[PDB]
Write a protein that binds this ligand. Structure first.
Ligand code: ETS
Ligand code: ZN
Length: 257
């Protein structure tokens, strides 16, 4: 099975998922001097007031916090998007050391972790149909740097003990994702893909310029999770990030100057 090890990591994915060598793969390095300011880009509209979280799960690759997407409760609009995108889940990617962990990079700089808030285009009816479309998903990416603690993240950190291994899930209701957002919503955007298999090229990436700060103790807790299931040899869940892919014939746009 695919993973992040030496024998099943990113360099091997192309054997089972040939699209790994495709034309619009993610993540990428964001060269701040070549990105172009596009004044036609609208500000992002994040409406998370009615978000209903349901559960937190360790799927063997990361931990996901899932939301009820049966209605337009928590949605993302505006920016480079056309239509309404519903929040379905969020997860993180992190490193074994503070100097690595993020998937996207900024002028080759790596952050300690990267948060992905995944949304799907409602015009396609269901998430499964959305992933088969070029504009089916919108993922909001937020960088994490180590510094002061992020209070809104603590409730997540505190429940990780209950989902240490692959397959474990815990009820996780009434969590407000607004607590994870930076002050500014300035962003870069480009067309890309999922960063894990199936690596489908159905994502409009929206990467925020402003990183959020989390404490050393908060990120340390992420690193205590396991890739393995209960009863199996312990493999710490760290470095679950894909390296930067070629930009090819794509242009990264910025909402700011
Ligand atoms: C572990 C599989 N993860 C996949 C398949 C899921 C069904 S998804 O919600 O389409 C999704 S979103 C991202 S990311 N890292 O580009 O934001 C990866 C994945
Ligand atoms: Zn991700």
């Amino acid at each position: 099975h695919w993973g992040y090890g030496k024998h099943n990591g990113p360099e091997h994915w192309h054997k089972d998922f040939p699209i790994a060598k495709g034309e619009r793969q993610s993540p990428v390095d964001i060269d701040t001097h070549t990105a172009k300011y596009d004044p036609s880009l609208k500000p992002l509209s994040v409406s998370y007031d009615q978000a209903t979280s349901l559960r937190i799960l360790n799927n063997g690759h990361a931990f996901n916090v899932e939301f009820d997407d049966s209605q337009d409760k928590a949605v993302l609009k505006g920016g480079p998007l056309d239509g309404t995108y519903r929040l379905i889940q969020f997860h993180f990617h992190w490193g074994s050391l503070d100097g690595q962990g993020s998937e996207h990079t900024v002028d080759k700089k790596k952050y300690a972790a990267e948060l992905h808030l995944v949304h799907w285009n409602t015009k396609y009816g269901d998430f499964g149909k959305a992933v088969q479309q070029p504009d089916g998903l919108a993922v909001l990416g937020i960088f994490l740097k180590v510094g002061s603690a992020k209070p809104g993240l603590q409730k997540v950190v505190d429940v990780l003990d209950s989902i240490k291994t692959k397959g474990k899930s815990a009820d996780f209701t009434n969590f407000d994702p607004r607590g994870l957002l930076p002050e500014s919503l300035d962003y870069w955007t480009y067309p890309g893909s999922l960063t894990t298999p199936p690596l489908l090229e159905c994502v409009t990436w929206i990467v925020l310029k402003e990183p959020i700060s989390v404490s050393s103790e908060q990120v340390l807790k992420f690193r205590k999770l396991n890739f393995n299931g209960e009863g199996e040899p312990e493999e710490l869940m760290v470095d679950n990030w894909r390296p930067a892919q070629p930009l090819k014939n794509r242009q990264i746009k910025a909402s700011f100057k």
